[PDB]
Amino acid sequence: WNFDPRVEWLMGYLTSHRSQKVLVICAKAATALQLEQVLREREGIRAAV
């Protein structure tokens, strides 16, 4: 979750559209937990699993 450019794109869009609720769909729950952890510890994005 540090080099995958999808994560950077997600963060950039969210941090640039902070006033929008965004529904983000991924395949597996494991990836979703990793995404919450990375969005929190590197952009502080609030995301419920």
Partner: protein, 231 residues
């Protein structure tokens, strides 16, 4: 039939220290303009300064890195003094990356076009280990005055990343201001004065632009005075 003061020679003794002269000042307006400019300069000069910092291996201002001797808090204290000139953008992200033994000075910042690091010798840290490496990203904004962290805390606005390190913003480049009104012997006049403004800054705002902006602000407020509604 009156006179009016024209901005004359602006001597630069050092990069930070500057003398600005104003030759044809009427009697009595010496002190008025001296003080007005001193006030405006000290209060209202816009400058850029670091607002928050992110270093990699550090959770909060109070922790400590391996291979450095300063505490992280002292690193923030060193960054507060960084004198930088931003031209176009309002928020820039500077990157500092150094490894190996040596003093991490301000010069090591990743060289961007729009940002000028005025004092590259300004120290930041000292490494003390061959394999010790520090990387950080310093965010620099433009602003006026003095804003502490604790006031902006009300407006946190998702400060959620615990890696974020907020720094108090001293958005003011000017350290010191003095002025002297002294007899300006003009070849056809008896009693005229010249105003000499001696200013010490961190070396970001140039003298001419500072004085011009201050005069601008004062003139604007005087403009506010010209009209009087009485309605």
């Amino acid at each position: 039939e009156f006179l009016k003061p024209r901005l004359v020679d602006i001597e630069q003794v050092s990069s930070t220290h500057a003398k600005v002269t104003l030759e044809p000042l009427e009697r009595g307006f010496g002190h008025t303009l001296g003080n007005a400019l001193r006030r405006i300069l000290l209060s209202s000069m816009p400058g850029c300064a670091v607002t928050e910092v992110e270093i990699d291996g550090v959770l909060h201002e109070y922790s400590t890195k391996e291979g450095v001797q300063e505490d992280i808090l002292e690193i923030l204290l060193n960054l507060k003094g960084l004198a930088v000139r931003v031209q176009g953008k309002d928020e820039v992200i500077l990157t500092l990356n150094k490894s190996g033994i040596g003093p991490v000075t301000a010069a090591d910042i990743t060289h961007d076009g729009d940002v000028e690091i005025v004092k590259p010798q300004h120290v930041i840290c000292h490494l003390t280990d061959e394999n010790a490496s520090i990387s950080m990203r310093i965010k620099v904004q433009r602003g006026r005055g003095y804003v502490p962290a604790s006031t902006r805390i009300h407006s946190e606005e998702d400060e959620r990343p615990i890696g974020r390190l907020l720094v108090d913003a001293c958005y003011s480049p000017v350290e010191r201001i003095a002025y002297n009104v002294e007899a300006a012997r003009v070849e056809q006049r008896t009693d005229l004065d010249k105003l000499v403004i001696e200013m010490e800054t961190n070396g970001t705002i140039d003298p001419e632009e500072a004085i011009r902006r201050a005069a601008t602000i004062l003139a604007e407020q005087l403009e506010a005075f010209v009209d009087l509604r009485d309605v």
